[PDB]
Design a protein around this ligand. Structure first.
Ligand code: CLA
Ligand code: CLA
Ligand code: CLA
Ligand code: CLA
Ligand code: CLA
Ligand code: CLA
Ligand code: CLA
Ligand code: KC2
Ligand SMILES: CC1=C(C#C/C(C)=C/C=C/C(C)=C/C=C/C=C(C)/C=C/C=C(\C)C#CC2=C(C)C[C@@H](O)CC2(C)C)C(C)(C)C[C@H](O)C1
Ligand SMILES: CC1=C(C#C/C(C)=C/C=C/C(C)=C/C=C/C=C(C)/C=C/C=C(\C)C#CC2=C(C)C[C@@H](O)CC2(C)C)C(C)(C)C[C@H](O)C1
Ligand SMILES: CC1=CCCC(C)(C)[C@H]1/C=C/C(C)=C/C=C/C(C)=C/C=C/C=C(C)/C=C/C=C(C)/C=C/C1=C(C)CCCC1(C)C
Lengths: 160, 189, 173
């Protein structure tokens, strides 16, 4: 079920997920988790270093998960769910169109504002980078959160 | 679609919707979940226009109702007026006459389904706008009407919802703009 | 035609007077034009007198009969006998005219045109060109009489003033 064509194929599917689920879905998923995790890791690190202007007073010092429990009350989180959900409904259409025969390759939403992938070759190198940073990010995010659970400390603070 | 592919203009990722063609006015190709596939586009177009034509009047009204009230009627925030008029029975008068016009409209929808009339044409052009001399303008106007309608429906929706949270009238909110109540003051924790 | 958007109803044809092609509902498709035409003239004729009566009765009451504050009340202050006497007189007039061909299939079986009772005691139907024009005037005034009567009566039941009186003091609800 695992073949060379997908980018990033080192051939590692010990549990054989590929055999039961369409690779196009699995890939769209790996990128989507990765793209989210990269942003999450960046945010958790950014949050410790800087906060937006009025934020500290309303939320105080809560960080990581604790901030979420406080954030939901602000409704900052809701706006995030409603807008992100609106993007996702288009994303559901995209997976459906792709699963139905369609041109779009998994993970392609057509966002290249700076025309960075215009060279065909450079795109391939970037694609490998994106899975790899994303695979790392997910591992890191999980770690930062678990570290948080146990130490009650933000990751930059744990380094401090 | 950074990889080359045939695709819809509005959204790069998705294919042009089938049975969705440039012919209806204001077709940027966006029907991401096909509804057009499930129900006939002309019946759907009649709906977009009807909702829009209703909406365009409503956006003007919510704004006009704030600034001015006919003298015989009291000035109250518009959402309140519906409650006042409904007790008054003014709303029933709007409902009855609007329903009568709609019954003529419902017959025209049946014709739209069986060929006959183009969606949304009631042949209401009392003025000469898009008259045979101005017939060239009709294609252009059609685009404006859908565009104004799409926008108005979003705008009214916005005015009413924003008004409920702010409890502040739309003209007032513009001139005095404040965060939803308590946010600057409140700390979640 | 009257509704630009809808196609003109088929059975409607220019022949009947005042045919503007206004049958969006298309009742004419379902039922004979003549039967309907008879009803439209008959409701219109009854109404013409109806409107005339509401205006006359508020102004004039028989010394013989008691008067109501509204023309509508006059129907109530009249003895019960009067209503039933009139009700029978009217029914007979229906019988004589329709020749006992009251039902939709029966009526018109022997021609009788549409909505014609052969009542021209004063001879005015002498010239055909006037008769058409007269037919158009009759049907238009009959439809107008239907709408007006409904209005005169409903306003009177509501407000209680007379139609002429209501103009003198509008007294809007
Ligand atoms: C969720 C993230 C995710 C997803 C969807 C994938 C998906 C894929 N990977 Mg990638 N990968 C990931 C994370 C992920 N990977 C990470 C973190 C690493 C670094 C360790 C790698 C390293 C890697 C290599 C080196 C290679 C792949 C390959 C593949 C493909 C085939 C592998 C397969 O069949 O298993 C699909 C994978 C999964 C089903 C993930 C299972 C994870 C656990 C065990 C699931 C446990 C159940 C879960 C907790 C239940 C909760 C789910 C709930 C939240 C909904 C497929 C497209 C191969 C490839 O490119 O083939 C073309 C390949 O050579 N991956
Ligand atoms: C998984 C992603 C993720 C999630 C769930 C959150 C969630 C949260 N953040 Mg964090 N944040 C993130 C990524 C994320 N952030 C990133 C990537 C940055 C770097 C810019 C930050 C920087 C940041 C700061 C400085 C602050 C938060 C704060 C918050 C909280 C309130 C939301 C808010 O106002 O943030 C606003 C966040 C942004 C405007 C960043 C959006 C950047 C997007 C991802 C760019 C996407 C690329 C785009 C297409 C290119 C343009 C909430 C717990 C606030 C808080 O309560 O902390 C005390 C706060 O002060 N975040
Ligand atoms: C044309 C027919 C017609 C008629 C007879 C009525 C009758 C009425 N409407 Mg109106 N209405 C109509 C059409 C009509 N409506 C239409 C098409 C709409 C839009 C959908 C409305 C919307 C509407 C609202 C929103 C309200 C009414 C109300 C009322 C009632 C109160 C009357 C009043 O204000 O005092 C008498 C009227 C005046 C003092 C105003 C001046 C009228 C002038 C003198 C008459 C001019 C001619 C007149 C418009 C007749 C037109 C037809 C004629 C030319 C053949 C009354 C029963 C109100 C209600 O329910 O009562 C509380 C109310 O709030 N109506
Ligand atoms: C045009 C679309 C739109 C609109 C109308 C809103 C409206 C709002 N957002 Mg949302 N938001 C949007 C898009 C939008 N957002 C998008 C695309 C994102 C990113 C995914 C977010 C992310 C987001 C977050 C994270 C938060 C909001 C918040 C708010 C509120 C602002 C606070 C307030 O009461 O007003 C006062 C507003 C100001 C003083 C600033 C106005 C600045 C100029 C004039 C505009 C308000 C209900 C906040 C909230 O929940 O407040 C209760 C909040 O924390 N939004
Ligand atoms: C004994 C009394 C009596 C009788 C036998 C009739 C008999 C008739 N009338 Mg009626 N009519 C009467 C009294 C009577 N009328 C009175 C007092 C008035 C008020 C002035 C009318 C006003 C009237 C109108 C306006 C019309 C008739 C019509 C008819 C004819 C259609 C038959 C039909 O469907 O009616 C049976 C009745 C029904 C099925 C339902 C009607 C319900 C009402 C309230 C009774 C029939 C010859 C119609 C006609 O000839 O057009 C084809 C017509 O349009 N009549
Ligand atoms: C739809 C028609 C209609 C109806 C149901 C009534 C019903 C009534 N009228 Mg009104 N009335 C009408 C038309 C009508 N009238 C017309 C057109 C006039 C003007 C002449 C009047 C003038 C009038 C007065 C002055 C009075 C009544 C009164 C009454 C009540 C007692 C009955 C009576 O005395 O009859 C009276 C009937 C007439 C004077 C004439 C009969 C009406 C028409 C012409 C009969 C049609 C028959 C035939 C088909 C037409 C061919 C002849 C044509 C050349 C005229 C009763 C509620 C009395 C009442 O209660 O008031 C307190 C009363 O005092 N009516
Ligand atoms: C404005 C009202 C009006 C008009 C224009 C007509 C016109 C007509 N009627 Mg109709 N009719 C009317 C009212 C009217 N009628 C009323 C109120 C009744 C009930 C009594 C009738 C009962 C009636 C019957 C039973 C018959 C007609 C017939 C006719 C036609 C021949 C009679 C004639 O020469 O008309 C001249 C009519 C007038 C000048 C109206 C008199 C108006 C005066 C000036 C004021 C009276 C108050 C003609 C098309 C006959 C027909 O079908 O012919 C083909 C026929 O059989 N009519
Ligand atoms: C776009 C950049 C930006 C972001 C993403 C962002 C996010 C949040 C969140 C999200 C979780 C909360 C909860 C929050 C809260 C407050 N912000 Mg802030 N905010 C941003 C920018 C500005 C500016 C420019 C100002 C400002 C202010 C306030 C006040 C005021 C009253 C107070 O101080 O009590 C409160 C409560 C004003 C001010 O007075 O700051 C001292 C002011 O000028 N913010 N802000
Ligand atoms: C498309 C297109 C064109 C166009 C166009 C345009 C201009 C489109 C513009 C669209 C816009 C601006 C849509 C805005 C959506 C905002 C939303 C849904 C906010 C939701 C808030 C939520 C869910 C909330 C919340 C909550 C929070 C945060 C916390 C709670 O404590 C409180 C609260 C309940 C308030 C046109 C017609 C020109 C032409 C063309 O033919 C095609
Ligand atoms: C197209 C497309 C898509 C889509 C989509 C979208 C975004 C559809 C959104 C549609 C919307 C928002 C339609 C809104 C209509 C609002 C109306 C008709 C307002 C009426 C107001 C009235 C009657 C009033 C009033 C009032 C007045 C004036 C003043 C007061 O005193 C009284 C009162 C309160 C009575 C998606 C991807 C989802 C799927 C798809 O594949 C294709
Ligand atoms: C027995 C009885 C009971 C109790 C006692 C009693 C009162 C003495 C007696 C009387 C009972 C009686 C006789 C009661 C009388 C009841 C009557 C005659 C009611 C008439 C109603 C007519 C209406 C609503 C017309 C509306 C016109 C419209 C919408 C026009 C539309 C138009 C169209 C179609 C075309 C053009 C466009 C426009 C202009 C819009």
């Amino acid at each position: 079920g695992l073949d060379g064509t997908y980018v990033g194929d080192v051939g590692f599917d010990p549990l054989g997920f590929s055999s039961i689920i369409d690779m196009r879905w699995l890939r769209e998923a790996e990128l989507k988790h990765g793209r989210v995790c990269m942003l999450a890791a960046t945010g958790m690190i950014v949050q410790d270093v800087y906060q937006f202007p009025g934020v500290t007073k309303s939320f105080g010092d809560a960080k990581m998960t604790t901030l979420h429990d406080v954030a939901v009350k602000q409704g900052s989180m809701q706006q995030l769910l409603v807008w992100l959900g609106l993007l996702e409904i288009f994303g559901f259409v995209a997976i459906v169109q792709m699963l139905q025969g369609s041109d779009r390759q998994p993970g392609d939403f057509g966002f290249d504002p700076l025309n960075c992938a215009a060279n065909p070759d450079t795109l391939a190198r970037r694609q490998l980078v994106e899975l790899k940073n994303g695979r790392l990010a997910m591992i890191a995010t999980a770690g930062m959160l678990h570290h948080f659970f146990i130490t009650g400390k933000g990751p930059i603070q744990l380094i401090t | 679609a950074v990889f080359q592919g045939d695709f819809s203009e509005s959204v790069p990722f998705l294919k042009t919707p089938t049975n969705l063609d440039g012919s209806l006015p204001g077709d940027v190709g966006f029907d991401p979940l096909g509804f057009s596939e499930v129900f006939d586009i002309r019946v759907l177009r009649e709906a977009e226009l009807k909702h829009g034509r209703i909406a365009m009047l409503a956006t003007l009204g919510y704004l006009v109702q704030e600034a001015y009230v006919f003298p015989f009627f009291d000035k109250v925030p518009p959402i309140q007026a519906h409650d006042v008029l409904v007790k008054s029975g003014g709303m029933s008068q709007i409902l009855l006459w609007t329903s009568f016009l709609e019954i003529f409209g419902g017959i025209a929808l049946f014709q739209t389904i069986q060929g006959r009339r183009y969606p949304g044409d009631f042949a209401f052009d009392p003025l000469g706008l898009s008259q045979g001399k101005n017939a060239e303008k009709l294609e252009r106007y059609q685009l404006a009407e859908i565009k104004h309608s799409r926008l108005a429906m979003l705008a009214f929706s916005g005015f009413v919802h924003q008004g409920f949270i702010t409890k502040q009238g739309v003209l007032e909110q513009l001139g005095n703009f404040k965060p939803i109540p308590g946010f600057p003051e409140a700390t979640f924790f | 035609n009257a509704m630009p958007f809808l196609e003109r109803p088929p059975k409607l044809d220019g022949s009947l007077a005042g045919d503007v092609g206004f049958d969006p509902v298309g009742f004419s498709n379902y039922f004979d034009i003549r039967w309907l035409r008879e009803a439209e003239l008959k409701h219109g004729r009854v109404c013409m007198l109806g409107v005339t009566g509401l205006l006359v009765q508020e102004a004039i009451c028989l010394p013989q009969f008691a008067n109501g504050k509204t023309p509508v009340d006059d129907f109530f202050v009249v003895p019960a006998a009067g209503l039933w006497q009139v009700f029978f007189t009217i029914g007979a007039v229906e019988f004589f005219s329709n020749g006992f061909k009251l039902t939709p299939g029966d009526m018109f079986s022997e021609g009788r045109e549409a909505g014609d009772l052969g009542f021209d005691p004063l001879g005015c139907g002498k010239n055909p060109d006037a008769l058409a024009r007269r037919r158009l005037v009759e049907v238009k005034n009959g439809r107008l009489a239907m709408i007006a009567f409904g209005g005169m009566l409903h306003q009177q039941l509501l407000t209680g003033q007379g139609t002429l009186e209501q103009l003198a003091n509008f007294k809007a609800i």
